[PDB]
Every structure is written in C-alpha cells, then in structure tokens.
RNA sequence: ACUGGAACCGGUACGGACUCAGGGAAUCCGACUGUCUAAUUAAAACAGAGGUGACAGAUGGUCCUUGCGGACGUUGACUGUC
RNA sequence: AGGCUCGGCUGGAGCUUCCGUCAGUGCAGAUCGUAAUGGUAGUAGCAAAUAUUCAAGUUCGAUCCUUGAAGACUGAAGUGGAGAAGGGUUCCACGUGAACAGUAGUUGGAUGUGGGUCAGUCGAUCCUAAGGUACUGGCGAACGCCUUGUAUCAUCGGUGGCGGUCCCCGCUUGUCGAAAGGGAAUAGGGUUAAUAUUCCCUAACUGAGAUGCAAAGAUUGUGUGCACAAGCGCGGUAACGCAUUCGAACUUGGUUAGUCGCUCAAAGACCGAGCUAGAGUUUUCUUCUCUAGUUAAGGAACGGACUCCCUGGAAUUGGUUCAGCCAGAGAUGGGGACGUUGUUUCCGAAAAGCACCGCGUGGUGUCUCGUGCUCUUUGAACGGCCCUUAAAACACCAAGGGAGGCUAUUAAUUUGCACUCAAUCGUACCGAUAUCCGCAUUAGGUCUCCAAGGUGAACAGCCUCUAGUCGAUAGAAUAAUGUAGGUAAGGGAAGUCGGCAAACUAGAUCCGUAACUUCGGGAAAAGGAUUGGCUCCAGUG
RNA sequence: GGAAACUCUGGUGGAAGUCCGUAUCGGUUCUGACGUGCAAAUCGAUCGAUAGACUUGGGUAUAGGGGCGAAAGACUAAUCGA
RNA sequence: UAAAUAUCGACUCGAUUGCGAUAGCGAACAAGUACCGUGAGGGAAAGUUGCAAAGGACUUUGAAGAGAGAGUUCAAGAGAAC
C-alpha cells in the first residue's frame, strides 16, 4: 500500500493501518507525511 | 467469538452479503416470478451451523 | 439430568468446515471429514448411500473441464489453426 | 469504591495474568500486569544462593550490565566462595597424596 | 510409584570428554557424595556393582 | 447538569464508636462471636511476648541484666510466668535485690 | 482496641429484628469419610482400610490385536494381577 | 336400481354416439394417506422474581416511548463493570406501515437505508505436554493397517584452516498438538453516534541492521624530549566492588516447580484529625453532613528481613521466634557484603485530570497529617503433610577450558550517540429471567476477574452509597375451592400405617455435665444463671 | 512432686479423608407446588457435604456384542438387558 | 488378436395405447433447494390475471389499512393471495 500510494499519487506516507471489514473488504488508513496535505490530495483525486 | 479465524470471517461476510432484500426493479422484468427474497435469514431464528 | 438442563452445556464443536467438500463435517479430534473422507486420498462413497452418491456425484457441480472437453471433441481436438481469415 | 476490569482478553487468574491495582493521574484505578520475577542462581555443587548476582528473567539477562552477572573470582557466578575453597583444598591435597603414593 | 529411592550416579565417559549419569535403585546406606565402584575388580563394599 | 451523589453519612457510626470507646454497647448481650473470635488469644499472646522480650532486650542493653539472669527471665516469660510488664518488672526488682 | 466490675434508669421484653441443634433411653443394619439407579428406589446396596488364598523368577504371568505387533512394564515378589 | 335426459344460472375450449378391444375402472369405514374445517369457545387461561404515582413532551393515537419530581428494589459471592466458548452484525444513527415483541406500542435484539472493528509492544504466530500422525519395517486379497520403539537405520552438522574445499570434533533427529502452560518489548491524558494499551498528543521500550560521529584501546616503571623494558584492567584480608583493558570448539550448570498453617512488610481499599473549594440542613442544635483535594509506563538516588565475610574464642552455656531453631563443623559482641519486593521534598509532571469562580477565552486551588488481630494483591521467611514428593521443550545467561586473534599513539575490539524497519490474521457488540444451548424474548443450564458503609465472628442475614432497574398485560372487587403465609381458649398425639406437617431448641459469657468407651470420644451430653441504656471504676502499650 | 522410673499443673502449637456453617456441589422429606407445566424433570421450604476418595474449564484417550462402570444392567448426545 | 455381444452412466437424437400438478422422477417453480441433525444423513410445499398491464389516472373520507365514486377491459363478480 505504501508503494502503491507513492506511485499513484506521488505522495509519501508515514504510516499505514489496515483492517478487514465485516464484509471482507480491506480498508487502509494512510497517514501522509507533514509535507503533503491530505485535503489537497483528496481534491486532486476527486473524492471530496 | 471475537477471536475468530479469517476463513470463518470470510464465510460470515458472504452470508451477510446474501442476507439482503431483493431489488425492487427485478419485479418489472419480463417473465419474472420472484416477489421477494425467499432465502432471508434471521440471526436468532435460523443459525449457520458452522 | 438428561434434557433441558443438559443441553445448556453444548458449546464445543465436534465438527468444523472441511477443506475438500466445504461441509461442516470435519471431525477435529479424528482429523477426518465424515462426508468426503478428507484427508484420505480417495473419496468416501458407499453403495448403501444411493442418495448421498446422487448428491455428491459428477454433474451436481459445474463440470467446467468436462464440458470444455465435450465441446472440443466435436471437432476432433483441432489445435494450432484459426478460422479462414475473412472480414465482415 | 472503584472496581477494575482486565485489560487483556485473558480472564483467568493464571500465573501469566497476575495483576496489580494502580491509581492513574486521571483518577482511575486500573490493572497493571506483573511479569515473572527473576531468581537468584544457586551453586553447581551446593544449593546455596549466590551473592553479587542480579536476578532477572532468562531473556532479560541479556540486557544487564556485564558486572551484574559475574563475580571476580574463579567459578564466580557458578560456585559459592566456600565451594571454591573446598575445591582448591581437595585439588591440592589429593594430588599431594597421589605423589606420595607414586613415590611409595 | 516406586517405594525404593533412586540413586543418581555420575560416571566419566572413558572415550570422550563427557559425564554419564546412571539411575539405579539405591541400596540402603548409600549416601550423596559416596563413591561406587563397578566392575570385576571392585571390592566387597555396600553399593558396589560386582559379578556374583 | 450532574446531580450530586446521594448522601450517606457516617455520623451515627462515629458517635457509636465514641460511645464504644467510652465503654458502651459491649455488654454480654451485644456479643455474637466467641471471645477468641472477637480478640484471638493467639494475638494477645503474641503482643505479650513481644512486650516482654522488648523489655528484657532493653534491660540487657542498658546493662541492668547480665546474660544469665536475662536467659532465665527470657525462658520464664516464654513459659508464661509473667502476666504483664508490671509483673515482670516487679519480679526483676525483687530478684536483683536478692542478688 | 479488648477485658472484668459497680451504681442508676425502663419495660410486656434486652442474642428485643436478623441469623442459628429440641433433648433423652433403647433395638436392627452398615464400622467410619465416600459412591450410586440423570427422569419414581440414596439404602441395610457398592467402595473401603484390614484379613486370607491363587498364580508368576521374565525362555514368565494376565490381557488386547485379522495380522504385524502391543498393554501392565520407566515394572521384578515390601512387585503384579486375580 | 346402478344412473340418465332436458330446463335455468355460472364458465370460457373442448366434448361426444355407436362397434370391437384394453384397463392405474366405482369407497363410509382400514386408531387409512393428504389438505382444509367445526362444537368445545370468546372458554382454560395470560397469577413466581415487593411497585409504582404525579406533571409535561411527541403523536391521529400513550399504563408501557422520552424528560423532570417522588416512592421502592438489586445491595459489591449485584438486577454493577469487563471477558473465554457460542452467536455473527444482533453494535451505532436516521426512517417505520404491515408482520413479530401471547395486552399495547409513537418503542425494539423487529423492519428499510446507511455507518462502524486501525497494533513492532494485546493475542495468534514461536516451544513443547498428554496425545495424534508420517516415514521406512512388518502385516494385509485389498482400500490400507500396526509400531513412534535399536522396530528401522548409509537419516548429519560444528569449529578452524584453505578458498568450493581439507583437518579435527561428535553421532543421527521426523512433524503436528495449549488466543488458560512456557513466552522479547507501552504507559498516561484526549478523541467518536459507534474503535482504542490499536487513532491523536506526550513520554518510553524490544528486536534486526549497515553506515556515520564521539570517546576509549592509545600506556606504565627505571634512568637521563631521549633510551631500555614491560600484554590483553583495577581495588578489598574477605564476603565482594568498579571499569569495559580480547577470546572459539567442547563440557558442566542457572533460569522460584505441590499443598496447608503462622508471622512480618509494601501497595490498593477502608477509617479518623484538620485546612481549603462547592453543595445540603438550620423551629432549635451542631467549628456541622456530603463531595473534590489524583500522579502512569520508564528512569536517577536510596532501601531491603534471609544468607554470606572478618575479628575472637564461648559452661556459671548463651543467642533467639508467635512457633521453631542455632553454636568449638566457631555462638554472643563488634565491624562489613549481597539482593529480587518497594519508597521518594527527584525527572515524566501539572502544560494533564479533578473541583470551583468568571467572561463571549480566562482565573483560583489541587495541602498537612495520622491509624490498624482490618480486608485483597504482591513479597519475605519459616513450619506441617505424603506407601501422594508436586511438567517438558525452546531460549538466554554463567562458569571451566585457552584453540586462536591484534601488536604501545597502530590494529583487533568493545562502549555511547545519530539513522532505517518491524509483515500476516483477530479486534464492533451480547455473554444472559431477551444476542449462547434448550422448537421461543423458555422461572432451566453454561468457565472466570474487580468487590463500598452500618450491625456483626463474618464475602452470613437485614438496611444503605456508586452503578443499574421498576421488565414481568392491566383495572375493579375481595364469594366458594385453592396455593403460600400468620394466629388460636381448655386439652396436648386422644389424629394417623406412622408425630407426616407444624411447633419447640439455638448467639455469646460463667457454671455443670452421665452410661459407655477402641481412652481419642460421648459433649453443644443432660441442665442452670447472665445479656438493654446511661454514668463511672480498674487492667492490658 | 519423686531415691529412681516417672507423674502432675499452666501455657504455647495448630494435626485431622474432625465439627458448625457461606459461596459452591448434591437432591432427603413434604410422598408440597405444577402435572394439556416456567420446565419432555422445573419451583418452594426442609435437607446431605463443604480443604478433600473435593468441585470444575480446555486439550487429549477409550466406539457398539465394543467402550466405561466405588456395580444401578448404570452411562455411552431427551435413544441402552446391546 | 477385430466382428457378431453387454450397457444409456456420459454426449447427441427420435418416439409412445404411459402421468397430467395428492399423478409423473424427491424436484413442471431461485429442488437435492428451504429446513432439520454434532455427524453419517433426512428432505419438503410451491403450475394458471389478461389477447395486450391497458396492473385501476383523477375526486372524496381516513394517520393508514381501507372504503365510496371513476377509468381500463370481450369481461373484472379476471384487481394482483388474481
């Protein structure tokens, strides 16, 4: 997930948490480094 | 149980997905006979003998 | 006391899910499936269980490869060739 | 008063689940788990406890400073001073008697 | 399960640098720190193992 | 708002304890456990032994008893010859006068 | 903190509620503690410690297994089973 | 007669005469099969677990949902707070009409739509136990079985040199099996409708790493900056202490092993005395009643029972515990050594939490003491018991050994800091008089942890505080019979198969206690007296 | 106290398949309740035991003419003289 | 060592003096399904509006179910469980 985030959005991650939801879907919480802004990256991606 | 196995969790997830009301637009298909989901399950009445 | 009182102690599963047949008939302590005989190499079937044979026999699943072979047999198992190159 | 609850999923009072009630800065009474305590070693010859050796769990012995596992003496940390004294005396006297017998 | 005490005895391996421990039922009067002599040339003493 | 807790005062208990210390509510009709359950004779004996041995240790340290008299009185105290500190002190004084 | 004692006071009464064996003389059976017919029998039944007897010195005894083999046995008569 | 024809109404697609021939060819029954429906009958019944009431909100609609006030209950071995197995979304929010919630329902564990489970440190993962299962080997007509054992067996891997290899050293063994055994390392505060040792903040720790920086190694003695010599550390009589001044194969060890009893200590809880801050009560009294006055992991410094060392030489024997027990095999005395539990006018850290007063984000305080046959937990040190003696592996550490290694301003080699990373899976909730098993929202069953005040011997019974409940279809009335409680004149087992049932007895202190006896008992034998409140006296440190 | 053997008195100590009794485990009597039940064995009171031959979770072993049995033909998933 | 022979289990076809939804395969249909048992295993019920959804717009009472009008239709007394 770390490498995929870096390669897809050109953003570095400081930590990745993962869980599997009751519907067997893997959900990841990726904390970006303080250099980047999560709101800006989300705006660029589209989900906002 | 809270401390379970991944395979059991997978089976439970599939059962959860299957336990769902039938889409309403299915009744408008040509030749349709299904009026509801006849395989719904209640956690307290019928138990998955896993 | 045999009955209502005794049924309250039933909370340890004798059988679990089998890897080969997916049934909840894998005996944990015996380490064998009471239905398909896993992990024996061979399958568990008995002629006195005619209905069980019917339930678990060929054709009750997908028979994906058998149907594929049947389809390919009709033309002699031809390989390495393509239809005549044509267009619309 | 204030009553506590286990913080792990082990609910049995086993040797691995020994607890101690502690008051936190937030005014709460909580459970703090006690690890197994180390034991002072014994002599190889006798069973008396050795001195100058810091007890610790076997895996935690690796973290101690060098001086806490040894004593500046032959067999230090393996034998008691009296055991070493007896060994030295026996070693000397038995060989002296062997020399006498060889002469004889 | 046994009514007679066992004696743990240590011998020296004759062919390699090692110690070999023997577990035998103790004869009455045997004590820790005692020396047991086993063989054809051992004397008649309590605890010695000798040919009959 | 967080309402105040319901009041549960110990005032009556404190007053009753003051009365008990003065000596009330302790007659025979107020006792439900045996004498040994209310005050173990083992605990009473432990207190007595510690008191007597401390007194003897103090005297020997202050050189008021030599080792021989100290030993004799120590064993007598263990043998239950002195009911209390006053008894022991009186006996010591008498024996020292005789000596 | 507990113990002993004395005056005075009241009232139907003072372990004031609460908690907690009625007692005794005999006969029969089983010594005792214990166990048991889950869902009609908790016993005088079974067990029991104690007693006696039998077999067995291992190339043995008593058992199981279709067979191979295995259990008592990490045992050896103060042992093992019956 | 079996049956048939026609009329009328319903219905919407097939039916039929006669001749042969064929048959799964005719029902009132079979405690017949199957489907449906009656009288019973608006009947039996919806009665265990103390209990609800007033005002208001919402709603078409309220005994039952929500708010407030009151009254009660569980009563810390709970109707409280969390877990293991099991369930599997029942968790949370917003809608809800029908069905279900044996009355109702605006409510719901129901129904519709969405949301929710975040870990290097908690577990699994890792080790092995009882035991399972393979190999070969034997057997077996065969699927396959039997043994887990010298039966079988040519089962390898370790240091060093060389750079695959040679020397030497030993001798062989699989693999599963525990979210209660063993085990690397995390704590506090805050945050969400629902996650929290996981997220945020702050502060730590463990393991695997190469690289970099700093300091060591890198001196001493003698003679006169130079010369010669000197290895791998020093102190203490000792128990041992201090620095980091190397070291392999191999060998031998350490790493609390039961249960019960008594003493002691620490922490938490509880209980007092004040001092603040806020509440409550004041016809009258009370310096009054209640609440808050907290300090994590990790560090530094101290402390530590037992045991050990030195001196010395003990009978007129001493020391000593509640109980033991210890001493010419070295006591007492005197002086020292060690160390787990733990403590702090110390860091963490008051910038937190808590209590209170303000404003539209501020301020103030968070302090001094005591006490104990008190409980829980931890620890120390001993005693009793056994024809009962209370795991194994992994891993780490230590010692003996001295193969080897670097060569006094070099080097080997440790030390400390600085950097990188720590995968995978579980994580919501219930855990039971409604989330489990019992056909169910069933008076049943189902493994554990925490545990306040009073009375009292007490985790007894009874009352109360924190927390939680008022959920058991409701109303009126109180006939007979009933179920469950409470009494009864005089008699006192006359009742009955039978004293069945009920009644009687009981706590504690003092006194007294028979036959018989296996001498231990019988025994609480039997049987008497006392018991409250208040004011004092005496004893026990 | 005694010539001795030894005896007596007061403490300490805390043994026992000891006793009363709570949690807990059982299930005696009422031949109580209920008996188309809360319940295909439950409910109330009264009772047996309560530091051991104790009570229990999980993991394991024993499988049908077999197992297991402190022995009732008991138990072996509401099924047991197969 | 081919042929003549066996056999519809598999794949592909043609028929019938057979049954016509309690019949015929257990299953004409989301049938080896729902559901039950720890397990081996057991195992259903369930066909039909109309030619065509044209599946009842709109008004009206009611919170709503629903009703009264109306409309579609050969016909709705064929109105969805038809």
Curated annotation (Swiss-Prot), chain A:
It comes from the Eukaryota. This protein binds to a specific region on the 26S rRNA. Belongs to the universal ribosomal protein uL23 family. This is Large ribosomal subunit protein uL23B. The chain holds residues 99 to 146 of 146 of the full protein.
From Swiss-Prot, chain B:
Residues 6-18 have a biased composition (Basic residues). Gene3D superfamilies: Ribosomal protein L39e (1.10.1620.10). GO terms for molecular function: structural constituent of ribosome. Residues 1-22 are annotated as: Disordered. GO terms for biological process: translation. The keyword Magnesium does not apply. GO terms for cellular component: cytosolic large ribosomal subunit. Keywords: Ribonucleoprotein, Ribosomal protein. SUPFAM superfamilies: Ribosomal protein L39e (SSF48662). Pfam families: Ribosomal_L39. Interacts with impact. Belongs to the eukaryotic ribosomal protein eL39 family. PANTHER family: LARGE RIBOSOMAL SUBUNIT PROTEIN EL39, RIBOSOMAL PROTEIN L39E. This is Large ribosomal subunit protein eL39.
From Swiss-Prot, chain E:
It comes from Caenorhabditis elegans. It is found in: Cytoplasm. Belongs to the universal ribosomal protein uL2 family. This is Large ribosomal subunit protein uL2. It comes from the Eukaryota.
Curated annotation (Swiss-Prot), chain F:
Keywords: Ribonucleoprotein, Ribosomal protein. The keyword Ribonucleoprotein applies. It comes from the Eukaryota. GO terms for molecular function: RNA binding; structural constituent of ribosome. GO terms for cellular component: cytosolic large ribosomal subunit. Residues 16-35 are annotated as: Disordered. One of its GO terms (biological process) is determination of adult lifespan. Transmembrane segments: none annotated. Residues 21-33 have a biased composition (Basic residues). Belongs to the eukaryotic ribosomal protein eL19 family. This is Large ribosomal subunit protein eL19. It comes from Caenorhabditis elegans. The chain holds residues 51 to 149 of 198 of the full protein.
């Amino acid at each position: 997930i770390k490498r995929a985030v870096h390669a897809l959005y050109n953003v570095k991650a400081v930590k990745v948490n993962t869980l599997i939801t009751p519907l067997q879907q893997k959900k990841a919480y990726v904390r970006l480094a303080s250099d980047y802004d999560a709101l800006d990256v989300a705006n660029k991606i589209g989900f906002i | 149980s809270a401390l379970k196995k991944s395979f059991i969790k997978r089976k439970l997830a599939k059962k959860q997905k299957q336990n769902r009301p039938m889409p309403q637009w299915v009744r408008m298909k040509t030749g349709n006979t299904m009026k509801y989901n006849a395989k719904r399950r209640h956690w307290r009445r019928t138990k998955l003998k896993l | 006391t045999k009955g209502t009182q005794a049924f309250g102690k039933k909370h340890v599963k004798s059988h679990t899910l089998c890897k080969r047949c997916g049934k909840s008939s894998f005996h944990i302590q015996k380490k064998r499936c009471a239905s398909c005989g896993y992990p024996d190499a061979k399958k568990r079937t008995y002629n006195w269980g005619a209905k069980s044979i019917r339930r678990r026999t060929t054709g009750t699943g997908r028979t994906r490869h058998l149907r594929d072979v049947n389809a390919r047999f009709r033309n002699g198992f031809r390989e390495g060739t393509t239809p005549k190159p044509r267009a619309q | 008063s204030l009553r506590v609850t286990y913080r792990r999923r082990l609910s049995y009072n086993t040797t691995s689940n020994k607890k101690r009630l502690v008051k936190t800065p937030g005014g709460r009474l909580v459970v703090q788990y006690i690890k197994k305590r180390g034991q002072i070693p014994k002599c190889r010859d006798t069973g008396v406890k050795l001195h100058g050796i810091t007890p610790a769990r076997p895996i935690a012995l690796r973290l101690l400073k060098r001086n806490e596992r040894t004593v500046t003496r032959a067999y230090g940390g393996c034998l008691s001073p009296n055991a070493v004294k007896e060994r030295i005396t026996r070693a000397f006297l038995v060989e002296e008697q062997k020399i006498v017998n060889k002469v004889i | 399960g046994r009514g007679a005490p066992l004696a743990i005895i240590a011998f020296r391996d004759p062919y390699k640098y090692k110690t070999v421990k023997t577990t035998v039922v103790a004869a009455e009067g045997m004590h820790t720190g005692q020396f047991i002599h086993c063989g054809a040339k051992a004397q008649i003493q309590i605890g010695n193992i000798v040919p009959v | 708002i967080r309402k105040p807790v319901t009041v549960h005062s110990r005032f009556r208990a404190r007053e009753y304890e003051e009365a008990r210390r003065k000596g009330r509510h302790t007659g025979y009709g107020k006792r439900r456990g045996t004498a040994n359950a209310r005050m173990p004779e083992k605990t009473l004996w432990i207190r007595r032994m510690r008191v007597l041995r401390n007194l003897l240790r103090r005297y020997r340290d202050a050189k008021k008893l030599d080792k021989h008299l100290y030993h004799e009185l120590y064993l007598r105290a263990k043998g239950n010859n002195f009911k209390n500190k006053k008894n022991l002190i009186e006996y010591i004084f008498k024996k020292k006068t005789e000596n």
